[PDB]
Design a protein around this ligand. Structure first.
Ligand SMILES: NS(=O)(=O)c1c(CC2CCNCC2)ccc(-c2ccc(C3CCNCC3)cc2)c1-c1nnn[nH]1
Ligand SMILES: [Mg+2]
Ligand SMILES: [Zn+2]
Ligand SMILES: [Zn+2]
Length: 231
């Protein structure tokens, strides 16, 4: 009941929310087709450093994210991973790289970001090209579940806390619509959700790309939302 909502965060400001010991989400707001939406990413403590998952959707928000981290946590962000190629995930990568953050994404994401004209993470993550593939990256596991919201979408698991960050492949429980599906695979999305369910059965917290965290129910709910859209 305390997670910040869209009407609570002016565009340009960033909030942090403690999810578990050494795990936070970051929440920002920005504009799509003239309407303001909230957007989440993740921060995971990596010894005396931090791993960032996703930008805060643009340059101004990403600079505000780094400032909020400086104030709230006080550990340096040394690496970031973007979970797909859209600008709510890579927009602000240039701000990160000018702050000394090493930025990473799969080659699939990098190719799509390049073709879209979005900022491109510096480094390429091999080992994620086939559905069900996983790689460990610092304190997280990166998992490619197959095409869903996008063909390159990754999910991120924090094994120390049983936290699953679904990114835009996972919708919040209040969702009654499927959001921007222009780059989605509506047929494969339920199969990709099933793979996440099977791979992370112990997840205690599930964080969507937009909206409120909850439990494992966000996964089946997402498949249901997508089916309602498809039909
Ligand atoms: N990842 S994205 O680019 O598709 C995206 C953006 C980023 C911009 C898209 C155009 N190019 C510049 C970046 C922004 C908004 C939204 C979004 C749309 C609708 C929803 C609704 C969902 C139901 N519950 C109510 C909200 C939430 C998110 C989305 C989005 N992300 N997941 N799906 N759409
Ligand atoms: Mg750009
Ligand atoms: Zn997207
Ligand atoms: Zn999104």
């Amino acid at each position: 009941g305390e997670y910040p909502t869209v009407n609570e965060i002016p565009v340009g400001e960033v909030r942090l929310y403690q999810i578990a010991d050494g795990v936070w989400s970051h929440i920002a707001t920005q504009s799509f087709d003239g309407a303001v939406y909230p957007s989440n990413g993740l921060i995971v403590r990596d010894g005396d450093e931090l791993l960032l998952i996703d930008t805060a959707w643009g340059a101004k928000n990403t600079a505000a994210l780094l400032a909020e981290i400086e104030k709230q946590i006080g550990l340096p962000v040394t690496r970031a991973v973007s979970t797909h190629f859209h600008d709510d995930r890579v927009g602000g990568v240039d701000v990160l790289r000018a702050a000394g953050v090493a930025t990473y994404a799969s080659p699939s994401t990098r190719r799509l970001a390049e073709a879209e004209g979005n900022e491109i993470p510096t480094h390429s993550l091999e080992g994620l090209s086939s559905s069900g593939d996983a790689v460990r990256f610092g304190p997280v596991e990166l998992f490619y579940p197959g095409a869903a919201h996008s063909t390159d979408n990754l999910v991120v698991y924090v094994p120390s806390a049983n936290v699953l960050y679904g990114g835009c492949a996972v919708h919040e429980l209040s969702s009654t619509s499927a959001g921007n599906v222009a780059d989605a695979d509506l047929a494969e999305w339920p199969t990709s959700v099933e793979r996440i369910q099977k791979h992370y059965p112990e997840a205690e917290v599930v964080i969507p790309g937009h909206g409120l965290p909850g439990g494992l129910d966000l996964l089946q709910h997402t498949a249901n939302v997508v089916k309602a859209h498809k039909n």
